[PDB]
């Protein structure tokens, strides 16, 4: 059938039809070991689980046991598990001869782990007096010790997160004993055990839970991978068309260049830094002129503009080089100032009443060196993180727990940096650089996700940003072209040319489909997407 295997297709169909809830169709289309073990677990008669009802499972990685150990392991509810442990104990004295090809032990370890999981479920079922101790001590300390021996006699354990598992398991089990509340707050039903056991089994013999849905989602991803302008987000098709980029409105307001642009957090105003504010919902009629400035911001209420001049201190409309406001309603109305003088003092829109100035403010360490010299700041949307530029090509991230100070991480990049452009509403950040590149970092885990190539940027200052939700990433360039990359994949989707360098690009955080670009030719243009 096609190029797949007919038997696999039939088995997948049967499991899917069963999983949907239907019974007769699946039970009729027929014309096990894992199944009977899972039934034993589900109904619950653990006293019937002998060794050979476990050793018969088709382990995911390796081949079954050699037909010498299973003989000693099949010589034939506290007494049942004690008997199983006694049967196991002799295999260690037999294997003391140390004749193993680094794989027989690699299977015995899995079997011991499955048995310990079942015993752990048995133990935790006692909390839902003097019986748990007699159970734990013998019938679990012996298994834990044996498992630790088997694990130690391998050249396979990761030093980090594979070597202390028996110790931490026994510690947790023993501390649950004189503290029963944790047993209640545990979510210890009889299906997570089946989940873990299934994780231990071969995945091409036990059909993974919900596979056809997974493959359908993958096929939808493949279809979406043909056109990157869509709303679908996980019958016939959802692709095979074409789209385009069209500019439609221009503003030849003056002959001077443009340093900075910004769009209202509600998509109803356009700022400029030639200060002018344009209405955007009324066919771009000049709203007002406010009276050099090199940075703009809007309040989260989309009411108050905040300039950031060159030498004068600040200005607000109904040295300092950057400013970013918070978002949380609890701490709303508060904002953060920057300065190329190693200073950063929280502040607000009362033109006074300063606050924490960080110019000298699971483990902790002593204070480090000084002179941060911030350039650009960003505030996480959950207001729980503050991102600061430096001039030596590093970023600092600070944690803000509650006002009504440590640093979580220091991201190193090397070359000189530029705009930061926090993603639009995991954790991400889009740092622009010289050396003709863009980087998509990750400030939570301090790792570089990926790079973007192809925009001329040397000895100047250019701007980049997100667009079209968080699906496209665009930037300016030295040659007057706008560059537009796909974000998930990282290929050059489009290179438009509408300036003759282009400095700034911005978007509505209110309209999915349009943006604006401004350059040094004395122009401001509005672009939109045709289908």
């Amino acid at each position: 059938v096609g190029c797949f295997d007919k038997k696999q297709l039939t088995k997948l169909l049967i499991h899917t039809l069963k999983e949907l809830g239907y019974d007769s169709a699946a039970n009729q289309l027929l014309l096990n070991h894992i199944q009977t073990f899972f039934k034993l677990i589900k109904t619950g008669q653990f006293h019937l689980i002998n060794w050979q009802i476990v050793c018969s499972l088709p382990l995911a990685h390796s081949s079954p046991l050699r037909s010498e150990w299973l003989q000693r392991l099949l010589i034939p509810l506290f007494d049942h598990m004690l008997l199983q442990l006694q049967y196991l104990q002799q295999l260690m004295s037999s294997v003391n001869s140390s004749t193993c090809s680094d794989a027989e032990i690699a299977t015995l370890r899995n079997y011991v782990e499955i048995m310990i999981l079942v015993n752990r479920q048995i133990f935790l079922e006692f909390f839902h007096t003097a019986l748990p101790v007699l159970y734990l001590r013998k019938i679990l300390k012996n298994f834990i010790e044996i498992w630790d021996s088997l694990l130690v006699s391998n050249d396979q354990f990761l030093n980090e997160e594979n070597i202390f598992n028996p110790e931490t398991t026994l510690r947790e089990l023993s501390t649950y004993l004189t503290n029963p509340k944790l047993t209640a707050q545990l979510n210890l039903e009889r299906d997570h055990l089946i989940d873990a056991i299934s994780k231990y089994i071969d995945p091409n013999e036990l059909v993974p839970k919900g596979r056809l849905l997974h493959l359908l989602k993958q096929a939808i991803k493949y279809q979406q991978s043909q056109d990157i302008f869509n709303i679908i987000d996980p019958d016939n098709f959802s692709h095979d068309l074409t789209v385009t980029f069209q500019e439609w409105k221009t503003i030849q307001d003056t002959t001077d260049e443009i340093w900075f642009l910004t769009f209202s957090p509600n998509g109803k105003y356009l700022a400029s830094a030639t200060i002018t504010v344009y209405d955007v919902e009324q066919d771009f009629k000049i709203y007002k002129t406010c009276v050099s400035v090199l940075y703009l911001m809007f309040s989260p209420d989309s009411r108050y503009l905040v300039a950031c001049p060159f030498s004068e201190d600040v200005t607000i409309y109904d040295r300092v080089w950057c400013c970013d406001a918070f978002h949380t309603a609890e701490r709303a109305g508060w904002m953060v100032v920057g300065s190329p003088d190693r200073e950063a003092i929280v502040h607000s829109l009362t033109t006074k009443e300063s606050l924490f100035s960080l110019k000298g403010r699971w483990q902790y360490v002593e204070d480090d060196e000084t002179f941060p010299r911030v350039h650009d700041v960003k505030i996480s949307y959950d207001d729980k993180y503050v991102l600061l530029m430096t001039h030596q090509g590093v970023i600092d991230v600070y944690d803000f727990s509650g006002f009504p100070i440590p640093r979580i991480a220091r991201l190193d990049v090397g070359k000189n940096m530029t705009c930061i452009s926090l993603p639009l509403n995991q954790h991400l950040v889009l740092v622009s650089l010289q050396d003709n590149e863009l980087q998509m970092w990750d400030y939570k885990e301090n790792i570089l996700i990926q790079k973007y190539f192809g925009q001329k940027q040397q000895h100047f200052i250019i701007r980049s940003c997100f667009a079209y939700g968080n699906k496209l990433v665009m930037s300016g360039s030295e040659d007057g072209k706008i560059y537009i990359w796909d974000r998930i994949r990282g290929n050059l989707v489009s290179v438009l040319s509408g300036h003759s360098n282009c400095n700034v690009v911005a978007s509505n955080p209110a309209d999915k489909e349009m943006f604006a670009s401004g350059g040094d030719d004395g122009k401001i243009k509005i672009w939109k997407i045709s289908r």
Partner: protein, 568 residues
């Protein structure tokens, strides 16, 4: 120290260096990674499915850029290992998982001293995968130095030895080099720059200059630096030559070798093989010299008369503490101080014996001390009986009666001192656990009752509530065994030791009783010992002037307090 940690640390670090005052931080270094080495002592530590080194390897490869426009998500681990093998061939299959036949693990421990020769960016040299076993300057298209640079204000003597085993009078220039680096062109042309303190091999003449004879086919040459008086010396075949340089304190150095393309060497920094020069026999000489130089009303001392609200104006005088044996003030102060320590904690019989004996020894200043001492031993008589009774109760293992006694004598203490009653009740529980050997049906009930008392009351603060749980879990982990004093691990079995219970309940309780009644709890003797041990370290930290100017011996670098003075 146990019977395994001593052996492991001896196997790890060089012998002569553990006898310096710089053994303390080395022991801390080892102690930070005790359990891991305990586990790993099984196998796979005698001469890949990454888990969390994944991100570090990814970053270290993307630093070079051999990965382009490829997302961090959806990366095949084996692909990363394969590409890593091309640019880090010597990776010994252990870093991925992350006498002494132990491979280079000192990267984990952060061993801050040179260990191997490091390879230059060029290919004009080749070292046998260790930087120690075999260095040879391969045929041309040769200088190099050690990896780390030893500090100056943290140790006393350093020494490493090389063995020449190939010849073109050989032509190797070895020694130390001052560090302002990661000046090399002249080093590659000649055998030395203007800042390379080295012992040549053409004739034997020291660099930057009839010093000694040339070495040849199979010779062992060692280069030792002595920070006590700022000297650099060389030795050959175990015979100490003359000291080569002088007046070199307050600098920074690194081992350095320049080798002609006809000769090969095998280095040694003392980690694996022992030396031949017997560096210990050189170090103890200077230790004895330092000891020789250092140790060859009125008696009562009060607060320091130079303190004004955190301001220490220093009267311009010769010295501050004029106590001398010849005058006799030192024995007077020592006697009053030792009696104060004795009557501070029990042992009042020994104090009375001391008073009697120094009443007998004196013959017709040395009686004002006796009179004051008698007044002191007879005034504080009520607290001494309480202390002795407390000692008897604690040593008898009757902690409940101890609580009854403490509440009986001092009325208003326990009602608002919860952080002490917890440390007492937990010890009572530990005594019960230790004694029980079918009370196991009652241990559980007792533990649950006291946990519900000290955890789920929520009138206590938050940090204290969180802290009262860790100790309870730790003591609970004891029940899983049957003979916890032997089967249990080092720490959990440490809870049951005589030390903890008997020498810690008393230490906490006595000081609590004293500090509640508005009396100082410092004995002014262990204060003296701790102050001395801290003063030695604070002198070592700041390179200091010996006697007159910073060109004489600095003798505080040889006083290893604990192992040489505090242990008989």
């Amino acid at each position: 120290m146990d019977d395994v940690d001593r052996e492991f640390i001896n196997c790890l670090f060089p012998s002569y260096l553990l006898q310096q005052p710089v053994a303390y931080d080395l022991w801390i270094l080892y102690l930070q990674h005790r359990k891991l080495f305990h586990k790993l002592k099984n196998t796979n530590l005698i001469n890949k499915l990454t888990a969390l080194t994944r991100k570090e390897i990814w970053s270290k490869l993307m630093n070079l850029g051999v990965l382009g426009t490829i997302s961090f998500e959806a990366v095949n681990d084996d692909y990363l290992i394969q590409v890593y093998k091309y640019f880090y061939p010597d990776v010994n299959d252990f870093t991925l998982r992350f006498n002494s036949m132990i491979p280079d693990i000192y990267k984990i421990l952060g061993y801050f001293l040179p260990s191997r020769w490091q390879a230059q960016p060029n290919n004009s040299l080749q070292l046998s995968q260790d930087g120690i076993t075999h260095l040879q300057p391969n045929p041309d298209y040769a200088v190099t130095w050690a990896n780390k640079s030893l500090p100056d204000n943290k140790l006393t003597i350093f020494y490493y030895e090389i063995k020449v085993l190939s010849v073109t009078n050989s032509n190797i220039v070895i020694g130390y080099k001052l560090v302002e680096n990661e000046s090399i062109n002249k080093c590659q042309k000649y055998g030395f720059d203007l800042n390379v303190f080295g012992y040549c091999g053409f004739d034997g003449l020291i660099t930057n200059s009839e010093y000694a004879k040339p070495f040849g086919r199979d010779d062992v040459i060692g280069c030792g630096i002595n920070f006590i008086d700022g000297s650099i010396f060389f030795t050959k075949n175990g015979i100490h030559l003359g000291n080569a340089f002088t007046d070199l304190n307050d600098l920074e150095f690194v081992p350095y070798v320049a080798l002609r393309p006809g000769n090969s060497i095998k280095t040694n920094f003392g980690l694996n093989e022992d030396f031949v020069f017997d560096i210990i026999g050189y170090q103890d000489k200077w230790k004895s010299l330092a000891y020789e130089h250092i140790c060859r009303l009125k008696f009562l001392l009060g607060e320091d008369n130079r303190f004004i609200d955190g301001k220490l104006v220093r009267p311009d005088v010769n010295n501050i503490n004029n106590l001398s044996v010849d005058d006799g003030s030192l024995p007077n102060t020592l006697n009053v101080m030792i009696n104060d320590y004795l009557i501070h904690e029990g042992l009042v019989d020994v104090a009375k014996g001391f008073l009697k004996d120094l009443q007998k020894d004196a013959v017709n200043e040395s009686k004002d001390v006796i009179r004051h001492n008698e007044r002191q031993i007879m005034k504080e008589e009520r607290m001494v009986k309480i202390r002795q009774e407390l000692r008897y109760l604690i040593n008898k293992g009757q902690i409940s009666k101890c609580i009854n006694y403490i509440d009986n004598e001092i009325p208003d203490l326990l009602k608002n001192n919860l952080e002490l009653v917890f440390e007492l009740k937990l010890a009572n529980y530990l005594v019960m656990i230790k004694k029980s050997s079918d009370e196991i049906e009652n241990l559980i009930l007792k533990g649950q009752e006291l946990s519900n008392e000290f955890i789920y009351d929520t009138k206590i603060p938050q940090s204290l509530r969180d802290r009262f749980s860790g100790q309870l879990s730790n003591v609970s982990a004891l029940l899983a065994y049957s003979n916890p004093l032997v089967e249990a691990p080092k720490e959990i079995s440490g809870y049951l030791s005589d030390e903890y219970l008997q020498e810690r309940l008393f230490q906490v309780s006595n000081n609590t009783i004293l500090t509640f009644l508005h009396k100082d709890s410092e004995c002014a003797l262990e204060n003296v010992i701790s102050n001395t041990r801290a003063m030695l370290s604070t002198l070592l930290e700041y390179n200091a002037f010996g006697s007159t100017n910073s060109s004489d011996p600095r003798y505080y670098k040889a006083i290893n307090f604990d192992e040489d003075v505090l242990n008989l």
